[model samples]
Target: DTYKLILNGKTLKGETTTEAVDAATAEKVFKQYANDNGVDGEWTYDDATKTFTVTE
Candidate 1:
């Protein structure tokens, strides 16, 4: 799976594996990405859409 973040008018992109053991593990990985990338935005995960979004 892939994740994208648009923060401070700049676009930052990252990718992760969906096969992260489980959903809880995936969420943790996502949060780590956010922190590492200095993301200051809101994130929403849509299980139906299988997409993650970040906005600033």
Candidate 2:
């Protein structure tokens, strides 16, 4: 599955498309949001829309 990474409710950044087939897939995927951008917020995963949003 693929997901759109929405940042800060202000920008449309990269994506979360991966071919990871394992149990720790969600953990690895979610950790990507806390990258070097210094973005801090709550990650809201919208399963309905298939979007991963980080609200600041």
Candidate 3:
């Protein structure tokens, strides 16, 4: 599955997916993805879609 970073239902700052095979793996990798790109604040993971959404 694809792991995506979304902001306001759109792709986040051109920061896109870190491909993964499962939900659990997606979350871990997405966390690092955010940090590496200097994205801050809170992000929520949707397990069903394997998406990480930037939240306030």
Clashes by residue pair, model 3:
none
Put down candidate 1 lDDT per residue, 18-52, tens digits, no spaces.
45655556677766777777776777777655556
Alpha-carbon deviation at 2 in model 2, angstroms = 1.6
Candidate that would win on TM-score:
3
lDDT on C-alpha atoms for all candidate structures: 0.59, 0.57, 0.68
lDDT of 2 by residue, 1-56 (tens): 55456666344354454444532475356556455455667777666766666766
Q: Which stretches of candidate 1 lie over 4 Å from their true place?
A: 1-18
TM-score of 2: 0.53
TM agreement with the true structure for every prediction: 0.59, 0.53, 0.63
**Per-residue CA lDDT of candidate 3, range 1-56, in tens?**
67787754233455478777786787777667666666666777777776778753
Output the lDDT of residue 34, model 2. Answer: 51
Error of 3 at 56 (Å): 5.8
Q: After TM-score superposition, what is the CA distance of residue 55 in candidate 3 from its true location, in Å?
A: 3.4
- The candidate 1 region of ten consecutive residues with least summed lDDT is 1-10
Q: List the residue pairs that clash in candidate 1.
A: none
